């Protein structure tokens, strides 16, 4: 017997509805809550203000153990590159200066790059992460001394050995095939890519 203190008992089985619509009067309880951490009101008596209810308990007889099949609905606007997912973040060890006067050798560092959030294709991403490597180069690497041939992290998608002739030992079209095979990376001496705190290693 699903005893509700106002109406007659509704014996047997029923349905409780927890809907995302705490927008009428239960919105002084969900001020700091989102559509995923909210406080509904499962009491739908259409004679009490949504707040005058929500102080009335649904009571099923206590001589029995009550089960209930939960069946849920859920939408999402979640994109690709958002930060919550930990996408849009990667670290790269990238040259900051050719011939550091202290050592006469290049000086590499560990910069954390950040792509603009939003839902991108699989290419526009790998071009947005190339537009961050070649966008920190403009501020740390331009005015410290490094040729564009020193950019040492380039997310490429070719199979660079297409044309490679074993006899001659080098590709013999005079160019790379520019046909996408896989997102692979292309590094240089010292430079690297760290995906520990990141999640682009999946995308």
């Amino acid at each position: 017997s699903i005893r509700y203190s106002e109406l007659a008992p509704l014996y047997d089985t029923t349905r409780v509805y927890l809907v995302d619509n705490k927008s009428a009067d239960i919105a002084s309880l969900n001020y700091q809550n989102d559509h995923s951490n909210f406080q509904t009101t499962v009491v739908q008596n259409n004679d009490f203000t949504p707040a005058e209810a929500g102080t009335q308990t649904i009571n099923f007889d206590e001589r029995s153990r009550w089960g209930a099949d939960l069946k849920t609905i859920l939408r999402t606007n979640m994109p690709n590159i958002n930060e919550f997912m930990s996408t849009n973040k990667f670290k790269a060890r990238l040259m900051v200066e050719k011939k550091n006067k202290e050592t006469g050798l290049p000086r590499y560092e560990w910069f954390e790059f950040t792509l603009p959030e939003g839902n991108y294709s699989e290419t526009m991403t790998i071009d947005l992460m190339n537009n961050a490597i070649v966008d920190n180069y403009l501020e740390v690497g331009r005015q410290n001394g490094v040729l564009e041939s020193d950019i040492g992290v380039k997310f490429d998608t070719r199979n660079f050995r297409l044309g490679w002739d074993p006899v001659t030992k080098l590709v013999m079209p005079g160019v790379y095939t520019n046909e996408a095979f896989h997102p692979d990376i292309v590094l240089l001496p010292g430079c690297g890519v760290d995906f520990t705190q990141s999640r682009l290693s999946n995308l």
Partner: peptide, 7 residues
């Protein structure tokens, strides 16, 4: 030398 590539 036969560089099979057409060129």
């Amino acid at each position: 030398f036969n560089p099979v590539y057409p060129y």
